């Protein structure tokens, strides 16, 4: 198919240290150079979430882009057995990796980045928890959450976990019990507000409004690399800009197409803009929100 | 308590005996008739081989008269609570179609909700028209779809399976003690069978029911008291009706799968644009099962439930009269004669003549060594039989006369020389 | 629009303990959540039966009415709904999916 | 399905005496092994108690287990003259035996592990009770018993067959009979105890108590085939064992997982448990419980 | 003819075989949430010892 959905707006960057010696073709992310910390996110068949909003940002672009902190240390380090930082937000999540990896991100409890990382020549096991000993040696990271990134400005760090019936989740412990326990891993999913923790949701209800708003379309330089065009520049519908754009029927039934007398050209994305959601009955601005396979732990006897 | 009552001997036809490794042991390939003994008597067997020494019993000890059921049709039920989640779309995108969403089917996951999870539970999609234009949030003057995807999870920490019944089937619970001593504790009801150690057991005659069962549905909790509720068996689940979301085991309502029958068109929505609060007005049997709770008072008997095994009874006020087929798989009783010393001494003697329960009888029985004891009258209808062994043991049992001066020579054994026994006591009239 | 069972509401008020004023509303046993859990009725009386041969009509922004016929079930001539739709947008810009009278738009 | 077919847990050892020509293909027993013992057990339309209760021991890997002792001699001859202790438990049966085999083994009255064997090169007959000259020969022997075993230790020295009303069964005196005799050959199930005879039953009740046991977890070597590794190498978490071990959730949550330091990745499995086995009303440990088709003298009248 | 009662073969007796639905998960003996089965083989025997023609 067409590789439309790797033009990312803004920086477009994915690349972590310690490892991933692929930086050279990951940064940015355009057509050419092949990038492993991208790709198993076009095939079809596995996150639809990140497909579907295929026009925003991703966790390391969000890194990149002064949105999401870097926690300490950032790649956990899993020679030393016995205890590492990475233990109980990933032993309980439930993944699956294409083997030939060592490297795999994910979200913390705090709201940074955390990510395991296999010292070469190591490899990631099926479910990209523990390494494992030894085809083609794969540097980079592998997404383990259907997580989406944007840009927000409201506040909301003032809210917890707004689950109810459950004694543990993932990793936050929000009552003690000691009975009976419904263990099994369930596909529950998560939010990030403005500064927050590891928000979890119990339902998750959207908000998209399309408009006018630069968010909402992939506007990139005309052909005939290629990095996010503000579409407030493009002249109105009966008047005049500054520079040129154009588009398709829905770009050019609103404002002014010149063809190939364009420096830009827009297209209509699906699923991109303000994107808001439900928490304590007051719609939100979020900015991280995916789902997770961990281990949920519910009330029974 | 222990006691023969009803005591018949076998015929000689299904009894044969052999001798192997100096002793006489003795098979039964046939089946005897004996009547079945009332609230706390029992109905023994006697067992003779070649001599009179060589005498053996089998002890069937029966609990009460019951009455049991016969389930036929069930289902589980439990209460629940419905968890949508909303999608507005504007129009011209993916597959935002009033014509689609007009004829959207249920089974159908669609595009913008295909990052859901592993859902095994009732789940639906649905769909709704709202608004559209500038006023409303969207690009085209068309208006904007609203994708419903709509699953049921179960809140409830228990659930309730609720049955009927279509005959009251008298079960007798009864207590088959086996010739060397082995206990056994099974159930006849009616004209079922069982597997016992000796063979196999059957209910014969059988004169005592209760009509009009089928308009009487039951309720079963795990582990507390059961129910009952003045109506008839539920039929189609529908809206307003109790039983309307129903399953098949504990595991599809404590856990919501999707293998369950409910009401369709039963989970309302509101919608509201970008809102939607979807309600089920769901009927709560927990209000019934207070209401009408186990034990009750219906007609002139008593409905409750059964220890142990799981299930419903009804207890009657009525006699016992019923027949007892003692079927033997050729099985060898073997008997090996005892040469153990005792001194027996009579106690007291009360109880009743010439009633259903008996007289209960209780002796001093002082032996050296762990035995058996056999007795038996002048005449021969009447046997006594007690565990014996070394010290200064009571054993009590319950034995039947007809005459309140009893006054009736036993002869008790523990080896082989026979001593005579006098036995008296006063017994009052019980019907 | 039809009833088929009257409904006792009772719209509550719930204010929080912080202070925030929050207004709902209750039915039968319908349950919504709020910020500290979650609302529902336990038991209900007073109803009125006997409310399918009647025909209620919804105005925007103007007020309610009632019709003392039945309700309409399937459209025809001569009888109230002979064009009905499913939104007022439907109504209001006369799309495909309203269902009309067959045999209904006369001709000379 | 059936992940555990041919994993053996525990020990996994199927030698047998006399016919040493599979001493290299047969210990331990994997998925790839080639041990002519194990093939026709799983093959379809022969055995099919053994491929109901596959995660468990068979008659050589409890020889093999400590917990049952061979017979004198091991190897029977055939071509003996009088005086043959494999020949009135041999002659008896009625199974059937397939071409391409020179030896058999089977279970006698002491409990001990009793087989038959042919002068090279002869094979067997039909009903393989004597042999005759000679696709490939077999390198090993034929079981003559669908039988199962596990880990008990329960004693069985005072219970003796419970077959009421029965003749004569296989080779043991039972009682004496005052009718007919009736010769058939039917199919009568026989329970062997920890050190005790040969006790036969009627209506066999087996049932199955699973609960948290380590021989309900099986591992396999990495590969950049399966291999085999054993469950009892794993010691508990917090602790250092012999042998290093690793695993996925289910696995790491009871056991310690040394993560690359493990040569053989381990999964979730389920078979084992606790069977149980109906004697005398009393559910007591069987040790090895299975079929046996001998003649069966019943009485007429 | 079910796979866990095929040893004992297809004779010419009154044989029968039904399955009811149970429990899974660790709560009952298993490791799925997916509820376990219940194979059984009824096969009739004869009690009496004699027959009748009616």
Partial sequence: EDPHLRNRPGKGHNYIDGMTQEDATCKPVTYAGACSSFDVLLEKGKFPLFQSYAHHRTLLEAVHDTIIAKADPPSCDLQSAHGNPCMKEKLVMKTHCPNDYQSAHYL?????????????????????????????????????????????EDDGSKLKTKMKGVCEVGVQALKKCDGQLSTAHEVVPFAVFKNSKKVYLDKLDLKTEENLLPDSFVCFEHKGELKSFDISQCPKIGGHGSKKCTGDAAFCSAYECTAQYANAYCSHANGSGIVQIQ???????????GYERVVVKRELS | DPGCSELIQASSRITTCSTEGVNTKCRLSGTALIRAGSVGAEACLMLKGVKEDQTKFLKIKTVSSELSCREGQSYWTGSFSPKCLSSRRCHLVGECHVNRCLSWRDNETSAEFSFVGESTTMRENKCFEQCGGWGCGCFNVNPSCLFVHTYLQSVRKEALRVFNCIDWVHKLTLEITDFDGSVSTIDLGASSSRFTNWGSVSLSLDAEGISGSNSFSFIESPGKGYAIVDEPFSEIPRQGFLGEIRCNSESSVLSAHESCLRAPNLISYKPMIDQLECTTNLIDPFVVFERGSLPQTRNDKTFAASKGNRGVQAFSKGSVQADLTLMFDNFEVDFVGAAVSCDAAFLNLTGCYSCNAGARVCLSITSTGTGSLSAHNKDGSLHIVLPSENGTKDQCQILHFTVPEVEEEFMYSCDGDERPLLVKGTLIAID
């Fill in chain 1, 108 to 152: 913390n409890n705090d709201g940074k980045m955390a990510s395991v990382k296999c010292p070469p020549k190591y490899e990631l096991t099926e479910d990209c928890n523990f390494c494992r000993q030894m085809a083609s040696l794969k540097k980079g990271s592998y997404p383990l959450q259907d997580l989406f990134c944007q840009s927000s």
């Fill in chain 1, 279 to 289: 928490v304590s009955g007051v719609w939100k601005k979020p900015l991280c929100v």
